[PDB]
C-alpha cells in the first residue's frame with residue numbers, strides 16, 4: 001500500500017511511518033517544509049492528491065507546548081491548523097480521479113466530558129461542552145467525506161506515551177530525577193496509549209477493510225493519574241512523591257488546557273477491540289517498562 005501522511009514528520013507520524021514501512025508499505029508525508037519523501041501543503045493545493053491507496057492526517061499545532069501562552073492567537077492556530085489541513089486533504093480526496101480506498105484522522109478523547117463517575121465508548125455523546133470537545137467535533141466534520149468510495153476512520157486518541165517525544169518528552173527527565181508525582185488530586189482518569197499501539201491501530205485501520213467509523217485510541221486500562229505516577233516511578237526506580245497542585249498547573253498552562261491535565265475521562269476502546277486489533281502494551285506497567293528500559 002501507498003500511504004500519504006499529513007503531519008507525518010511528528011511524534012505519532014514518525015512511529016507510524018516506521019511501522020508502515022516495516023509492514024511493506026510506502027509512505028509520503030505532507031509537511032510545511034519541503035524535502036525528500038514528502039510534499040508541501042502548498043503543493044497539495046496546487047496540483048492535487050499524489051497517487052496513494054490511503055491517507056492519514058496528524059497535522060496540528062502542538063497544544064501542550066508550555067512555551068506558548070493560551071491566548072486567542074494560539075487558540076486560532078490550534079483550531080485552524082487542524083481544520084485547514086484536514087479540509088485540504090478531504091477536498092483533495094473528493095476531487096482525486098483515482099481516490100484512495102481509506103482515510104483516517106486522529107483526534108482526541110477530549111470529545112468525552114471529563115468526569116469522575118462516567119464511562120465512555122465510541123458511541124458516547126460529547127463534543128459540545130468546552131473548547132477541546134468543540135475542536136474535535138469541527139475537526140471530525142472537516143474530515144467527513146460524503147459517499148462511500150473511501151472508507152473513513154477516526155481514531156480518538158488518549159495520551160500517547162513513548163520514547164522520543166510527546167508528553168514523555170516533558171515528563172521523563174523530571175521523573176528520572178525524583179521530581180515526579182501526581183497532578184492535582186491524582187484521582188482523575190488517565191486515558192493513555194503506547195505509541196506502538198496507536199501506530200498499530202492506525203495501521204490496522206489502513207489495512208483492514210472492515211474497519212470504519214470512530215475508534216478509541218486508548219489502552220484497555222483504568223489507570224488514574226495517581227496510578228500513572230506511581231507505576232512510572234516504579235519503572236524508573238525512583239521516588240515519585242511530589243504532587244503538582246492545581247493552581248500551579250493552571251498558572252503554567254491556563255485554565256482551559258489545565259483540564260487536560262487535572263481532569264479525565266474513563267474511555268473504553270470497545271469498537272477498537274471489535275476490529276480484531278490486539279494490543280502490544282495493554283497494561284500500563286508493561287508500557288512504561290518498555291519506555292524506561294530503552295533510552
Ligand SMILES: NC(=O)C1=CN([C@@H]2O[C@H](COP(=O)(O)OP(=O)(O)OC[C@H]3O[C@@H](n4cnc5c(N)ncnc54)[C@H](OP(=O)(O)O)[C@@H]3O)[C@@H](O)[C@H]2O)C=CC1
Nearest residue numbers: 007009010011012031032058059060061081107157159160
Ligand atoms: N498525546 C498525543 O500526542 C496526542 C496527539 N493527538 C493529535 O495527533 C496529531 C499528532 O500528534 P503528535 O505527533 O504528538 O504531534 P506533533 O506536534 O509531534 O506532530 C504534529 C505535526 O504536524 C505539523 N504541524 C505542527 N504545527 C503545525 C501547524 N501550525 N500547521 C500545520 N502543521 C503543523 C508538523 O509537521 P511539519 O513541521 O512537517 O509541518 C508536526 O510534525 C495532532 O493533531 C494532535 O492533536 C491526539 C491525541 C493525543
